[PDB]
Design an enzyme around this catalytic site. Structure first.
Site, PDB file in Angstrom:
ATOM      1  NE  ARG B 127      -4.044  -2.012   2.192  1.00 31.08           N
ATOM      2  CZ  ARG B 127      -3.899  -3.014   3.056  1.00 31.08           C
ATOM      3  NH1 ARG B 127      -2.884  -3.016   3.911  1.00 31.08           N
ATOM      4  NH2 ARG B 127      -4.765  -4.025   3.064  1.00 31.08           N
ATOM      5  CE  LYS B 149      -1.129  13.400 -14.811  1.00 27.64           C
ATOM      6  NZ  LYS B 149      -1.655  13.828 -16.141  1.00 27.64           N
ATOM      7  CD  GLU B 191       6.909  17.619 -23.505  1.00 27.35           C
ATOM      8  OE1 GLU B 191       6.273  18.693 -23.482  1.00 27.35           O
ATOM      9  OE2 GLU B 191       6.356  16.505 -23.621  1.00 27.35           O
ATOM     10  CE  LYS B 247       4.894  17.820 -14.904  1.00 24.90           C
ATOM     11  NZ  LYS B 247       4.934  16.875 -16.069  1.00 24.90           N
ATOM     12  CD  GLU B 257      -4.381  27.943 -10.622  1.00 31.38           C
ATOM     13  OE1 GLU B 257      -3.794  28.793 -11.325  1.00 31.38           O
ATOM     14  OE2 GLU B 257      -4.221  27.865  -9.387  1.00 31.38           O
ATOM     15  NE  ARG B 261      -2.806  21.370 -11.125  1.00 36.14           N
ATOM     16  CZ  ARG B 261      -3.542  21.134 -10.049  1.00 36.14           C
ATOM     17  NH1 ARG B 261      -4.670  20.445 -10.150  1.00 36.14           N
ATOM     18  NH2 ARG B 261      -3.147  21.586  -8.874  1.00 36.14           N
ATOM     19  CG  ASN B 265      -2.088  18.661 -21.860  1.00 40.13           C
ATOM     20  OD1 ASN B 265      -1.380  17.664 -22.000  1.00 40.13           O
ATOM     21  ND2 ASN B 265      -2.872  18.837 -20.806  1.00 40.13           N
ATOM     22  CG  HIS B 268       1.243  17.527 -25.302  1.00 44.29           C
ATOM     23  ND1 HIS B 268       2.126  18.586 -25.316  1.00 44.29           N
ATOM     24  CD2 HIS B 268       1.858  16.528 -24.628  1.00 44.29           C
ATOM     25  CE1 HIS B 268       3.229  18.240 -24.678  1.00 44.29           C
ATOM     26  NE2 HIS B 268       3.093  16.996 -24.251  1.00 44.29           N
ATOM     27  CG  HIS B 272      -1.117  13.437 -27.073  1.00 48.04           C
ATOM     28  ND1 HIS B 272      -1.793  13.864 -25.952  1.00 48.04           N
ATOM     29  CD2 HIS B 272       0.166  13.230 -26.686  1.00 48.04           C
ATOM     30  CE1 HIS B 272      -0.955  13.912 -24.929  1.00 48.04           C
ATOM     31  NE2 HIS B 272       0.239  13.532 -25.348  1.00 48.04           N
ATOM     32  CG  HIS B 284       5.911  12.767 -26.105  1.00 48.67           C
ATOM     33  ND1 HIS B 284       4.572  12.916 -26.403  1.00 48.67           N
ATOM     34  CD2 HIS B 284       6.180  13.654 -25.117  1.00 48.67           C
ATOM     35  CE1 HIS B 284       4.059  13.860 -25.634  1.00 48.67           C
ATOM     36  NE2 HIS B 284       5.014  14.323 -24.847  1.00 48.67           N
TER      37      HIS B 284
HETATM   38 ZN   LIG Z   1       4.485  15.514 -23.211  1.00 51.27          ZN
END
Ligand SMILES: [Zn+2]
Ligand SMILES: [Cl-]
Ligand SMILES: [Zn+2]
Lengths: 382, 383
Positions: B127, B149, B191, B247, B257, B261, B265, B268, B272, B284
């Site tokens: 956990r 993430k 990026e 970042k 907010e 964030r 993108n 992207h 993407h 990418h």
């Molecule tokens: Zn990216």
């Protein structure tokens, strides 16, 4: 009448008779808005309760446009379905529907410890986290399992080794599930209930001693079709049960107290590691509380009369109080827990051992688990 | 060492040579533990693991009981980023004697693949156990490792199962870049430029200036013993940490907010869509480069962005070796023609009207969130 109990801020615990039929479906839609509602359960539990729910769903789901959907998944019964592969079967299953289950999904965990832990853990990682609610079907799950946000699965190397802390958005305690919960399973859950009482309120423990006969009489009685298993004691049962869950909830919202929730489990777990799966958790923890109560008496902390009440009360609810208990004996075929194995399984969790000690029924020795010498512990094992 | 705060505390530590003279020591003093599990792929590990094992006992012998180091090398490629590999690493940690406890501290030495997998393993091991980020790739230094993430891939899609687990530490050793394959570097600069173009026209200008220099260093052959980036250490450091710093600021800006964030993108939306088609032949950063270009053209199309700005985006991206059009010879070759129809592109996007991040000027977003744009308008830039 829909008793609400809070945990960590807001009230997620809703307890009452008949929630599954007249309240759950409706509540989900209004408080857990979503386009997808995923229900998880095992074939048995689902063949009985799922049906009446699907109906309760469209009913209250039709008053919305567009109407949300209900996807159902029935995993095989047993703690078998609590594995890395079933968790996966489910995830891939949700990801495969069209449209794929998104992040607005709301997972329903209908079942006991096994269903709760697995389902809870699936939602915790599904697309890095989705909402989910608990509908414990077993007593043990109602007052302990479902509450806390502890989710996980089992591996060939041990129980609950992979998992996460994910709090359920809702916890529906339908006390009507008990009406059909196998007798043994009920007695089993009463172990934690008594555990909670004995470590927080001597008055609550007293009410348990009083209601023992009655409650146990209902639990065992031959219920005439059309009658409610617990007629006349609805309020008594409700009180005694929610009292335990309420305490569990209070401990969760608060490592002093939480530690007290392991009273009986120090030795209990040691016993269980040996007697499982023939003997259940609550049954082992019952014997565990007994032994741990004798130890406090041994250290001069607890008085004998108190130790007697623990034992009498546990027995009054059909729980075992000694490894000599016949039922146990028969079920395990003579499986014998040695003081060495027991002491080994306890340290499996060093030179000392942290045992929760009571100085009086409803009054812990320290507001934490105490430290006790091995030799002193080896005296209450036999 | 420079230090950036992410979410209250400061876990980002950036400097040259951290892996050799600071990581091992810091772990022990700030991440006290008896078990330190290092995860990486065979390649990355055969190069850097060795020097670390040594740096470890050195500083680990000064503590009693001296903590242990268990090492796991997963096969390279985004292959090791699966349910199965996660399971193995777990059973492997459960199979140690003594097995890895809750005090364990997992080390993620590698790039996006290693970071995501490792991060996700720790999130669920009993956990939850502590862990740190040692991003080996530029892309992973300024974006991947920062944010918490973590996840794995399934036959049905990327990062579908995972959790948000913040790393206790994020060690940015800018010395990894000295040996980071050229293409991988250019790749990460996408990026970096992205961040600048959506927050500081001032910072974006620095990128344009250092463009030649930086790119010259990356390409030069470094004589043994010398430092790839001699003379521009500070320049490089500034430009890189500037992106990671932003970042970190976006991660930290709590509350609902998801506007800032959302600005992360930019490029992207279309990027993407391109990537879903050209991957894994095209990376990418490369796709997101073309994506920014397109999404910048769109802002110009809606009259939001001025042409001169669009040209700069394009010039700057190219000055750093990044592609700016699906016609780019290098793309063209690696994808063996393989066409990206304006249809598949609008489908891959829908697969996620349309909301694109729009800029009104370099370093200045249109809205403090992603804007809503009509499909027909988006299709006119994909023609
Ligand atoms: Zn990216
Ligand atoms: Cl998992
Ligand atoms: Zn328990």
């Amino acid at each position: 009448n829909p008793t609400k109990i809070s945990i960590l801020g807001r009230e997620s615990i809703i307890a009452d008779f008949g929630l599954w039929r007249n309240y759950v479906a409706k509540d989900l839609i209004s408080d857990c808005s979503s386009t997808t509602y995923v229900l998880v359960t095992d074939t048995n539990i689902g063949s009985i309760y799922t049906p009446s729910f699907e109906e309760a769903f469209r009913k209250r789901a039709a008053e919305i446009t567009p109407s949300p959907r209900l996807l159902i998944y029935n995993r095989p019964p047993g703690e078998v379905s609590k594995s890395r592969q079933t968790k996966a079967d489910i995830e891939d299953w949700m990801l495969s529907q069209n449209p794929p289950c998104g992040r607005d999904t709301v997972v329903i965990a209908l079942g006991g410890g096994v269903i709760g832990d697995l389902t809870g853990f699936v939602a915790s990682t599904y697309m890095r986290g989705v909402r989910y609610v608990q509908v414990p079907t077993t007593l043990l799950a109602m007052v302990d399992s479902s509450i806390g946000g502890k989710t996980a699965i089992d591996t060939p190397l041990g129980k609950n080794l992979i998992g996460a802390i994910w709090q359920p958005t809702k916890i529906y305690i339908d006390l009507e599930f008990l009406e059909t919960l196998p007798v043994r399973e009920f007695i089993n859950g009463m172990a934690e209930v008594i555990k909670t009482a004995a470590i927080s309120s001597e008055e609550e423990f007293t009410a348990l001693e009083e209601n023992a006969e009655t409650i146990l009489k209902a639990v065992r009685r031959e219920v005439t079709p059309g009658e409610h298993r617990f007629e006349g004691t609805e309020e008594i049962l409700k009180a005694r049960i929610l009292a335990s869950a309420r305490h569990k909830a209070y401990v969760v919202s608060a490592g002093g107290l939480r530690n007290l929730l392991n009273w009986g489990h120090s030795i209990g777990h040691a016993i269980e590691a040996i007697l499982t799966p023939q003997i259940l958790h609550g049954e082992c923890v019952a014997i565990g509380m007994v032994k741990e109560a004798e130890l406090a008496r041994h250290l001069g902390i607890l008085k004998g009369v108190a130790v007697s009440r623990i034992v009498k009360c546990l027995a009054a609810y059909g729980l075992p109080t000694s490894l000599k208990d016949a039922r146990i004996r028969k079920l395990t075929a003579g499986k014998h827990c040695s003081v060495d194995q027991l002491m080994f399984n306890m340290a499996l969790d060093g030179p000392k051992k942290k045992i929760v000690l009571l100085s009086a029924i409803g009054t812990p020795y320290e507001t934490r688990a105490s430290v006790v010498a091995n030799e002193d512990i080896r005296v209450v094992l036999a």
